[PDB]
Motif scaffolding. Structure first.
Motif, PDB file in Angstrom:
ATOM      1  N   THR A   1      -3.876  -6.527   4.204  1.00  0.00           N
ATOM      2  CA  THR A   1      -3.894  -6.967   2.885  1.00  0.00           C
ATOM      3  C   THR A   1      -5.509  -7.249   2.543  1.00  0.00           C
ATOM      4  OG1 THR A   1      -3.574  -9.069   3.262  1.00  0.00           O
ATOM      5  CG2 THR A   1      -1.627  -7.731   2.910  1.00  0.00           C
TER       6      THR A   1
ATOM      7  N   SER B   1       1.247  -4.958  -5.226  1.00  0.00           N
ATOM      8  CA  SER B   1       0.013  -4.077  -5.444  1.00  0.00           C
ATOM      9  C   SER B   1      -1.281  -5.020  -5.588  1.00  0.00           C
ATOM     10  CB  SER B   1       0.351  -3.340  -6.624  1.00  0.00           C
ATOM     11  OG  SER B   1       0.970  -3.813  -7.746  1.00  0.00           O
ATOM     12  N   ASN B   2      -1.080  -6.138  -6.088  1.00  0.00           N
ATOM     13  CA  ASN B   2      -2.333  -7.091  -6.118  1.00  0.00           C
ATOM     14  C   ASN B   2      -2.912  -7.463  -4.787  1.00  0.00           C
ATOM     15  OD1 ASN B   2      -2.402  -7.235  -8.956  1.00  0.00           O
ATOM     16  ND2 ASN B   2      -1.404  -9.283  -9.066  1.00  0.00           N
ATOM     17  N   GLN B   3      -2.042  -7.275  -3.664  1.00  0.00           N
ATOM     18  CA  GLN B   3      -2.554  -7.702  -2.596  1.00  0.00           C
ATOM     19  C   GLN B   3      -2.964  -6.435  -1.911  1.00  0.00           C
ATOM     20  OE1 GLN B   3       0.452 -10.440  -0.535  1.00  0.00           O
ATOM     21  NE2 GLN B   3       1.354 -10.104  -2.637  1.00  0.00           N
ATOM     22  N   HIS B   4      -2.744  -5.131  -2.495  1.00  0.00           N
ATOM     23  CA  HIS B   4      -3.394  -4.076  -1.926  1.00  0.00           C
ATOM     24  C   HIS B   4      -3.343  -3.473  -0.393  1.00  0.00           C
ATOM     25  CE1 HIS B   4      -5.499  -3.272  -5.805  1.00  0.00           C
ATOM     26  NE2 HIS B   4      -5.754  -4.435  -5.692  1.00  0.00           N
TER      27      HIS B   4
ATOM     28  N   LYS C   1       8.664   2.567  -2.496  1.00  0.00           N
ATOM     29  CA  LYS C   1       8.053   2.529  -3.623  1.00  0.00           C
ATOM     30  C   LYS C   1       8.039   1.266  -4.313  1.00  0.00           C
ATOM     31  CE  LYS C   1       6.215   4.784  -7.456  1.00  0.00           C
ATOM     32  NZ  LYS C   1       6.488   4.181  -8.808  1.00  0.00           N
TER      33      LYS C   1
ATOM     34  N   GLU D   1      -3.069   3.210   0.641  1.00  0.00           N
ATOM     35  CA  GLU D   1      -2.643   1.993  -0.016  1.00  0.00           C
ATOM     36  C   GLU D   1      -1.348   2.300  -0.388  1.00  0.00           C
ATOM     37  OE1 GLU D   1      -5.267   0.029  -2.331  1.00  0.00           O
ATOM     38  OE2 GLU D   1      -3.876  -0.774  -3.983  1.00  0.00           O
ATOM     39  N   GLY D   2      -0.368   1.446  -0.014  1.00  0.00           N
ATOM     40  CA  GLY D   2       0.982   1.399  -0.609  1.00  0.00           C
ATOM     41  C   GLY D   2       1.628   2.508  -0.406  1.00  0.00           C
TER      42      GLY D   2
ATOM     43  N   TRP E   1      -3.074  -1.836   2.994  1.00  0.00           N
ATOM     44  CA  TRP E   1      -3.452  -0.630   3.224  1.00  0.00           C
ATOM     45  C   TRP E   1      -2.730  -0.442   4.545  1.00  0.00           C
ATOM     46  CZ3 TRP E   1      -9.458  -0.642   3.178  1.00  0.00           C
ATOM     47  CH2 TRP E   1      -9.819  -1.066   1.702  1.00  0.00           C
TER      48      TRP E   1
ATOM     49  N   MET F   1       6.733  -1.676  -2.721  1.00  0.00           N
ATOM     50  CA  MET F   1       5.108  -1.571  -2.866  1.00  0.00           C
ATOM     51  C   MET F   1       4.622  -2.215  -4.359  1.00  0.00           C
ATOM     52  SD  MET F   1       3.974  -0.716   0.086  1.00  0.00           S
ATOM     53  CE  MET F   1       4.736   0.362   1.411  1.00  0.00           C
ATOM     54  N   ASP F   2       5.338  -1.752  -5.247  1.00  0.00           N
ATOM     55  CA  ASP F   2       4.847  -2.210  -6.470  1.00  0.00           C
ATOM     56  C   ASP F   2       4.939  -3.601  -6.818  1.00  0.00           C
ATOM     57  OD1 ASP F   2       4.355   0.524  -7.170  1.00  0.00           O
ATOM     58  OD2 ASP F   2       5.925   0.679  -8.547  1.00  0.00           O
TER      59      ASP F   2
END
Ligand SMILES: Nc1ncnc2c1ncn2[C@@H]1O[C@H](COP(=O)(O)OP(=O)(O)O)[C@@H](O)[C@H]1O
Ligand SMILES: Nc1ncnc2c1ncn2[C@@H]1O[C@H](COP(=O)(O)OP(=O)(O)O)[C@@H](O)[C@H]1O
Ligand SMILES: Nc1ncnc2c1ncn2[C@@H]1O[C@H](COP(=O)(O)OP(=O)(O)O)[C@@H](O)[C@H]1O
Ligand SMILES: Nc1ncnc2c1ncn2[C@@H]1O[C@H](COP(=O)(O)OP(=O)(O)O)[C@@H](O)[C@H]1O
Ligand SMILES: Nc1ncnc2c1ncn2[C@@H]1O[C@H](COP(=O)(O)OP(=O)(O)O)[C@@H](O)[C@H]1O
Ligand SMILES: C[S@](=O)(CC[C@H](N)C(=O)O)=NP(=O)(O)O
Ligand SMILES: C[S@](=O)(CC[C@H](N)C(=O)O)=NP(=O)(O)O
Ligand SMILES: C[S@](=O)(CC[C@H](N)C(=O)O)=NP(=O)(O)O
Ligand SMILES: C[S@](=O)(CC[C@H](N)C(=O)O)=NP(=O)(O)O
Ligand SMILES: C[S@](=O)(CC[C@H](N)C(=O)O)=NP(=O)(O)O
Ligand SMILES: [Cl-]
Ligand SMILES: [Cl-]
Ligand SMILES: [Cl-]
Ligand SMILES: [Cl-]
Ligand SMILES: [Cl-]
Ligand SMILES: [Mn+2]
Ligand SMILES: [Mn+2]
Ligand SMILES: [Mn+2]
Ligand SMILES: [Mn+2]
Ligand SMILES: [Mn+2]
Ligand SMILES: [Mn+2]
Ligand SMILES: [Mn+2]
Ligand SMILES: [Mn+2]
Ligand SMILES: [Mn+2]
Ligand SMILES: [Mn+2]
Ligand SMILES: [Mn+2]
Ligand SMILES: [Mn+2]
Ligand SMILES: [Mn+2]
Ligand SMILES: [Mn+2]
Ligand SMILES: [Mn+2]
Lengths: 355, 356, 356, 356, 356
Positions: C249, C116-119, C109, C201-202, C121, C112-113
Motif C-alpha cells: 500500500t 483506492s486511497n491506499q493505492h 473490483k 494498482e487495484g 499495488w 478495490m474501489d
C-alpha cells in the motif's frame, strides 16, 4: 536449400549483367542453356553478341569439329535473376553456317515475314503434367491412382489442385519476363495444368512459347519437380496433353470473318496427314497415343470440325460462331510440338495455298 | 515449397492484370476457377468481359457441344495475388443462353431486386471442419479421437485450437478481398471453426458467402488441408456443421420490430418442409444426419422457435428479445447449403407470402 | 505452416478492425475467446460493444437458454494481429444479468474501489511449465527425466534452457500489448519459466495477469506447445509452480513502511486457511500437491514469515528489510490461482480487517 | 530379440535346477524375485530351502541391518524356463523373524485354518489393462482415444481385441505352471482383459492369484508391454478394473445353500466400510476412483445386493438364483487388492461372525 | 510378437482343456467369445455346460439384470489352440429363458427339422474384403486406388493377390476345425477374397458359416488386418461382396431334378421382397448399395433366373443345366447376411410353400 540461395541473390550485383542463352537441342524437344557476363545491359536483342556451344554434347555435331553457333533471336527479362539480366532464345547454326537440323525457326520466320500483311495471330494452349522426380505424377498416391477424373479441372483444394505453386510462380515469371501469357487453368487429369500464350503475331508465337517452356522447366527445377509435355503420360482412362493452336488472320477478325475461318478449315480438311506429321517431333507417332477420339480428342485418322466441339479436329468456339468473327482452334497438335512447325504448317496450308 | 513461391510472387508484374473467374459446378457444391490476363485493371465488375469454360469437364454439358458461358456477377480484390488482380464470381449459362441447372443466383437476384425497399439483410454463420488430406480431421489422433467435446469451443492452446493459422489467414484474406466477414470462432468439435458473413443486403449475401468459401478452400490449399462443409463429417457424439442464417427486414430493425420478427416466424412455421428442401443440395438428405435435436440442433421433423434457445429451429437472440428489435436466426441450413437457395426461400416465405 | 501464414498477415487489412473478446469459462481456469469485425478502431475500452456467447458450450449455461453476456473490462493491443486490432478481456454475466459463478472480477473490483486511497499495488510471479503436446515437459527425454535440478534456474545453453523462444516471444507480445510485464527468468525445473507482472494498482492486476496468460497460451499455440499452470505438474523431486503475489500500500512504500508491512503480515497470520481456499480454483486441493515445505515452499498447514526466506509462507525481501519500506511477498498462491480471488483476499484481510 | 534367446533356452540344462523366489515388497503391490541353482529337483515346497534378500532395496528394512527372510509357501512349475525348474511364492519375515508389514498371508493362513471344516472356496476375476511402455493403453491411438466402449467386451478382430497374444500366452503359462486358471475374456474397455482363478480352497486363493499375477507381469515383459492393476487407469467414460471375489462354503454349495448365501450377504451389509478398507492397498482411496455406481460398479458409499445385478455391491448370479445353491460375487474389490486381505475379510465377517 | 507367443503355445498344457464359447451379439453381425477351463476334453457338444455372459456389455440386456444364457449348439476343434481345445458356437437366451432378439438359429432349427426328409443342402460363398487397421483395403495404395479391376480375380503375384497368407491360414484352420470348407478363390476387387462352405445339410449350414467367420476374424487378427462383410465397402467401380447361397433338396439332386429346381425358382419369383428383407441384417438397406445390376449383381428391384447368368438374381450353373440335376444359386444374399435367416427363408418359400 532456397533460403540460402536467396541470401546470395540479394547481393547487389554491380555494373555487370548476366545473359542466359537458350537453345533447342538435337532431340527437337530438349532445351539447353548457359550464361555469360556482359559489360552492360543490352537495350535490345540486336546488341547481344553471337556465341557458341559444344554441339557434340547436345547430339548436334562431332567432338573433333564441335563448336556450333548461337545467334540471338528473342530477348526477355530474366525472372530467376531479375533486372538487368536477360534470357536469350537463340537459333543454332552448324560449322558451315547453315541452320541446325532442329532449327525450325529459320524457315518459319521467312514464311511469317511473307504473310505479314495478313497479320496472323496465334494462341497456343500448353497443357503439361507435373511429375515427381520418381516418374509418378505429382501428388498422386504412391504406386497408385487418385480418384477418377471429374473434380480436377479448374479445381480448388489440397485434394484436387496438385502443384498450384508452380503455376502461380510460372505465371508471374512470364509476366516479369515479358512473355505474353494469356491465362492458366488446372486440367482434367490431376497434376495436369495449362497456360495459354497469345495472341502472338507471326514468329513471336514460337519465340514466346519456347521461352514460356524454358521458364516452366526452370521454375519446376526450383520446386524439385518435372514438367512433361508428353501427349499421353498416363495410359488408360486419363487425359492426354495437347497444344491446341488458335489461329486467325486480320480478315477472320473483321466483321463476318467466319467466312474465312470456314475457308481455312476447308483447306485444312485436305491436308490432314501433312499437319499430323507437323504436329509432333516424331512425325505423328507421339500423337498416336493421344488422338484416339476419346478424352476430348479427335481420332488421329479423321478430320472433323464443329462449333464448341471438343471432339473435333478443329473447334469453332461458341463466341466466334455467335459473333461471326474471331479465330478457330486446331486441337490436333501434341503438347510436345515445336510451335515453329505448327505455326508454319498453318500458314502454308491456309495462307500460301500449298497442297 | 512456399518460400520458393514467395520469391516469384515478389517479382513486380508490370502493366497486365490477372482475373480469376470462379463458378459453381454441376454438383451445386464444388467451386471451379481459372485465370485470364487483362490489359488493365478493371474499375468494377461491369468492365470485365464474359468468358466460358468446358462444361463437359464440370458435369454440366456434353463434350461435343461443350462451351458454357461465364458472366461476371461480383468482383473482389485477390488476396492471393494482391492488387491489381481480381477475383470474379460468375453466373453460369448454357449453350442456349439459359441459366445452368446449378445457377441458383439468377432467380434469387430477381427476387431480391423485387423486395429491395424492405432492405433484407442476412448474416450467415459458415461452420466447417478442417481435414487432413487422409480424410481424418486436422490435428486429431491418427486413427483415433481426441478427448470429448467441452474445451474446444472458442478455445486457445495447441491442445485444443487445431488449425488457427488457416482461420487467421482466411480472416485477413477476406478483409483484403472486400468480403464482409463479421467474425470468427473455434467451434465445439475439435478441428471445427466458423466465420460469419454479414450483414449483407440482398443478393450480396450469396455473393460474399460463396467468395468467402472460395478463399477458404484456396487458403486451406496452401496449408495442405481440406475444409469440409459436410453437415455431419464425424458420426456420433460430435457436433455437426450448420450455416445459421440470421435475417432481418427494415421493419424488424426499427423500434418494436420484434412484432415483425414474430410474424416472419409464424409464417416460417407453416413452411418447414419447403425450407428443409431448400436448405441443402440434396433436398434435406444431408441435413437428416445433422438435424437430430441433439448437439445444438433442432429435429429435422419439428419446427420450433425460442429466445436464446440453441435447440429450436429458430432462435431469437437474447439481445433481440430485450431490445424488441433486430433479427432472428434460422438454425436449419446445412453448412453445405447454397446461400442463394436459402436466402431466396426466406424472401418468398416471409416477404412475398408464398404458401405451398 | 507459419511461413504461409505470415504472407497473409502482411496483407494491408483496410478500414475494418478485429476485436478478440476473451473470457474465463466454467472451470474458473480456462480462457476462451472469439473475434468480431468493427467499423473503426476503438480508442477506450468503453467504445467496445457488449457481446455474448454460447454458455452451454463453456459449461456455464443450458443450451435451451444459452446466450451469456460479455461486458468489456480491459483493452489491449493485439500482438498476434497488430495495430489496430485489439484484445478485450471481458466479464461474463448470466441470462438474468447477474455475474457468472466464475466471474470473480465483479466483487474484486468493488473491493478495490473501497480502498483506492491506499493505492494497493500488486506484483505476481507467474511460473509455468512448457509441455509437449504428448503431456511430457518440453525438451525432456522421451519417457524419461533430464538430470536433477541445479543448472536450469536462470540457465543458458541448449542443454538447460528449454523453450526460450516462447519466453522471448511472450515478453515482446506483452510489451506491445501494453501488459505490464516486469521481467522473466528460467526456473528451477527444466522447461519451467516465469514472468512477473506488476506493479499493478487495484483491479488492473487481475486484468493484466489474465491477459498475460492469454497471450502465453496463444504464443505457445504458435510454437506447437502447451503452458500448464498446474502447481505440481511432475511429482517427486521437481519444483512446483506458484504465483507469488507481492503486495504494498502507499503506507508500506513510504519511509518506515515496514511497520505496516509487518502489521499486514500479522493479520495474514490469523487467516491462513481462508487464503489457502482463495489461492487455487479447487479451494486448496491443488496447492496440497505443491505446498509441501520442500522445493522452496511452505507447508500448506503452517503459516510462517521471514526475511529472505524462500521457505516461509510470506517472504520479506532483503532489500525491503534493509530499506525498511516497500512490499512483502505472499508465496502461497498456486500458479493456477485466479488473481481476482488472490488480490481480493489480501485486501479484505489486510486493509478491511475482516475476520472469518 | 527372442529368437536369440530361444536358441539358448534349447540348450539342455543338465542336472542342476533353477528356483525363482517371489515375494511382495514394501509397497504391498509390487512383486520381486531372484533365482538360485539347486542340486536336484524338489518334489514339493517343503524341500526348498529358506533364503533371504536385501530388504533395504525393496523399502522393507535398513541397509545396515538389511537381510530379510524368504520362507517358501507355494511352489509351481516354471513356464518361462520349463521343467524341472520352479517358481516359489514366499513369505517375508524381518530380522527378528516376525512377519513383514506387507506379509498379509501369515494372518490369512491362520484364519483359513480356523474354518477349514466349512471348506471356503474362492474365485477371483483379475481384470487388468495392458499399457505401452509410453504409459498409454496398448493399441490405443497415440495421444488419443479409440472409439467408445461397446464392441470390445469379448471382442474378436484386429480393431477390437488388443493384445490377445499376452492373454493366450498367460493362459497357457498358468496351466503349465499349475495355477488354477478358470477362464479368460476381453473386457469392456479396449486393451482391458480378464482371467479368473478358481475355485481355490482357503489360503490357496491368494497363493494362486499372486503367482498368476507374477506370471502375467513376466509374460508381458517378454512382449514389451505392462499390465496395470490400477482400478481406474483411464479417467472418464471408461471402465475401471475390479477383482470380483466369488465365495462359497460347503453349506452354500449344498442343496438350498442360498439360505446361507443370504445370511452371508446380511452380515456383509453391516460391515461395509470395513470391507472397503480391506479391498485396496490404500484402504479405500484407490477404489474411490472406480466405485462410482457407473461403469458396472456400485457406489463406494452404498451397500446393495441383487440377482444378476452388475450395479450392486454383491451379485447373486442367475445360475445360483435358479438352482438355490452355489456362491456369490463380491463386486467391490479393486484390481490392485491383496487377495489375502480380501479373502481374510470375508471369512471374518461371514464365518467368524466378527462385528466392529 | 508372434515368435514369443508360439514359444508359450509349445508348452504342453496337461489334463485341463480350453473351451472358447462363441456367440452373436446385439448387432446381429458381431461375434463375441470367451474361454473357460474344463477338467477334460469333451467328445460331443452335448457334454459342454451351459454358461452365460454380460448382456449389458453386448447390447442385449440392462446392467441391473444382465446375465444372459449361452447354450452350446455346435462344437469344433480349436485351430488357434489345438487339440484338445474346443470352439463352441452357442445360441443366446434372455433372462426369461427366451431366445435373444438376434438368436435366429432357434426358429431356423425347427424349420430345418420339418423338412429333414427332403435333406436340404446349402453351400454359401462368403466373399469378403481385407482392410488395414486404417480403414483402407489391404495392399491398396495409401490414400489411393490400385489399377482397374480385371487382373485380380483368381490372380497370382505380389501385384494382384493381396493377402493370400490370410486365405491359406484360414483354409487350413477350417479344415483342422472340422468346418466344411469347399474351396477358395481370389475375387474381382483387389484385397477381396472368397471361401465356400458346403454342402451342409440343414441347420449345420449356418453353424459352419458362422464358425468359419469367427475363424476368419481370429486369423485376420493374428495378421493385424480386418475382414469386412460389408456388401459395398468401396463405392464406385469396384465389386461389392455377396454370399451366394447355393441350394438343393434330394429331389433336385436326383435324376431330372431340374424339374424341381425350376419349381423352386418359380416360388422364389413371387416372394422377392420377403427374401431381400431376409438377406441382410438391415432388411435390405445394406444390399441396396450392392444389388445395382452392375458388378455381377442383379438389380435389387428385379427378379431374374438364368443359366450361367451372373446378372441374374438366381443362376443355374451350366453344369446343373447340362446334367438336368443338382442345385441352383441364389445370388442375392449380402456378404453380411445371417445364414440362419437366409437358409430359413429358402425352406419356407420353396418347401413349406409360404406366401405373403
Ligand atoms: N483472334 C485470335 N487469334 C488467335 N488466338 C486468339 C485470338 N483471340 C484469342 N486468342 C487466344 O486463344 C487462346 C484461347 O485458349 P483458351 O482460353 O485456353 O480456350 P479453350 O480452353 O476454350 O481452348 C488464348 O491464347 C488466346 O489468347
Ligand atoms: N440486423 C441484422 N440482420 C441480419 N443479420 C445480422 C443483423 N445483425 C447482425 N447480423 C449478423 O448475424 C450474425 C451473427 O452470428 P454470430 O455472431 O455467430 O451469432 P450466434 O450468436 O448465433 O453464433 C453475423 O453475421 C452478424 O453480422
Ligand atoms: N511496491 C511494490 N508492490 C508490489 N509489487 C512490487 C512492488 N515493487 C516491485 N514489485 C513487484 O514484485 C515482483 C518481484 O518479482 P521477482 O523479481 O520475481 O521477485 P522474487 O523472485 O525476488 O520473488 C515484480 O512483479 C515487481 O514488479
Ligand atoms: N462355488 C464357488 N465358490 C467360489 N467360486 C466359484 C464357485 N463356482 C465358480 N466359482 C468361480 O467364480 C468365478 C466366476 O467368474 P466369471 O466366470 O468371470 O463370472 P462373472 O464374470 O459372471 O462374474 C470363477 O473364478 C469360478 O471358478
Ligand atoms: N448339390 C449341392 N447343394 C448345395 N450346394 C452345393 C451342391 N453341390 C455343390 N455345392 C456347393 O455350392 C458352392 C459352389 O460355389 P462356387 O464353387 O463358389 O460357385 P460359383 O461357380 O458360383 O463361383 C460350394 O459351396 C459347393 O460345395
Ligand atoms: C479441357 S480440354 O478440352 C482437354 C484437352 C485434352 N487434354 C487434349 O487436347 O488431349 N482443353 P481445353 O478446354 O483447354 O480447350
Ligand atoms: C456453438 S453453436 O450453437 C453449434 C451449432 C451446431 N454446430 C449446429 O448448428 O449443428 N453455433 P452458434 O453458437 O455459432 O450459433
Ligand atoms: C526460484 S523460486 O524460489 C521457486 C518457487 C517455487 N517454484 C514455488 O513457489 O513453488 N521463486 P522466486 O521466483 O521467488 O525466486
Ligand atoms: C463386464 S464386468 O461387469 C466389468 C466390471 C468393471 N470392469 C469393474 O470395474 O468392476 N465384469 P464381469 O462380466 O466379469 O462380471
Ligand atoms: C466372381 S462373382 O461373379 C462376383 C460376385 C459379386 N461380388 C457379388 O456381389 O455377387 N461370384 P462367383 O464366385 O460366383 O463367380
Ligand atoms: Cl548457366
Ligand atoms: Cl488459374
Ligand atoms: Cl477468433
Ligand atoms: Cl533372476
Ligand atoms: Cl478368451
Ligand atoms: Mn484451354
Ligand atoms: Mn485444356
Ligand atoms: Mn483449347
Ligand atoms: Mn455463431
Ligand atoms: Mn456456431
Ligand atoms: Mn448461430
Ligand atoms: Mn521470481
Ligand atoms: Mn520463481
Ligand atoms: Mn518470488
Ligand atoms: Mn467375469
Ligand atoms: Mn469382468
Ligand atoms: Mn464378475
Ligand atoms: Mn464362387
Ligand atoms: Mn465370388
Ligand atoms: Mn457364386
Amino acid at each position: 536449400n532456397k533460403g540460402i540461395k536467396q541470401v546470395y541473390m540479394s547481393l547487389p550485383q554491380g555494373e555487370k549483367v548476366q545473359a542466359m542463352y537458350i537453345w533447342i537441342d538435337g532431340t527437337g524437344e530438349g532445351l539447353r542453356c548457359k550464361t555469360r557476363t556482359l559489360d552492360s545491359e543490352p537495350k535490345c536483342v540486336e546488341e547481344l553478341p553471337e556465341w557458341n556451344f559444344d554441339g557434340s554434347s547436345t547430339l548436334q555435331s562431332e567432338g573433333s569439329n564441335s563448336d556450333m553457333y548461337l545467334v540471338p533471336a528473342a530477348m526477355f527479362r530474366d525472372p530467376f535473376r531479375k533486372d538487368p539480366n536477360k534470357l536469350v532464345l537463340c537459333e543454332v547454326f552448324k560449322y558451315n553456317r547453315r541452320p541446325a537440323e532442329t532449327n525450325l525457326r529459320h524457315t518459319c520466320k521467312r514464311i511469317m515475314d511473307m504473310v505479314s500483311n495478313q497479320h496472323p495471330w496465334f494462341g497456343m494452349e500448353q497443357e503439361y503434367t507435373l511429375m515427381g522426380t520418381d516418374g509418378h505424377p505429382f501428388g498422386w498416391p504412391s504406386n497408385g491412382f487418385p480418384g477418377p477424373q471429374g473434380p480436377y479441372y479448374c479445381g480448388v483444394g489440397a485434394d484436387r489442385a496438385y502443384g498450384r505453386d508452380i503455376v502461380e510462380a510460372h505465371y508471374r515469371a512470364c509476366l516479369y519476363a515479358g512473355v505474353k501469357i494469356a491465362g492458366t487453368n488446372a486440367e482434367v487429369m490431376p497434376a495436369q495444368w495449362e497456360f495459354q500464350i497469345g495472341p502472338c503475331e507471326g514468329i513471336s508465337m514460337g519465340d514466346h512459347l519456347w521461352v514460356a517452356r524454358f521458364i516452366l522447366h526452370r521454375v519446376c527445377e526450383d520446386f524439385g519437380v518435372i514438367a512433361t509435355f508428353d501427349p499421353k503420360p498416363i495410359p488408360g482412362n486419363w487425359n492426354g496433353a495437347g497444344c491446341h493452336t488458335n489461329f486467325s488472320t486480320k480478315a477472320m477478325r473483321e466483321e463476318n470473318g467466319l467466312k474465312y475461318i470456314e475457308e481455312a478449315i476447308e483447306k485444312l480438311s485436305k491436308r490432314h496427314q501433312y499437319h499430323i506429321r507437323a504436329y509432333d517431333p516424331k512425325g505423328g507417332l507421339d500423337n498416336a497415343r493421344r488422338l484416339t477420339g476419346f478424352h476430348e480428342t479427335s481420332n488421329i485418322n479423321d478430320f472433323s470440325a464443329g462449333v464448341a466441339n471438343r471432339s473435333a479436329s478443329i473447334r469453332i468456339p461458341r463466341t466466334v460462331g455467335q459473333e461471326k468473327k474471331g479465330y478457330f482452334e486446331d486441337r490436333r497438335p501434341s503438347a510436345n510440338c515445336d510451335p515453329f512447325s505448327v505455326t508454319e504448317a498453318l500458314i502454308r496450308t491456309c495462307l500460301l495455298n500449298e497442297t
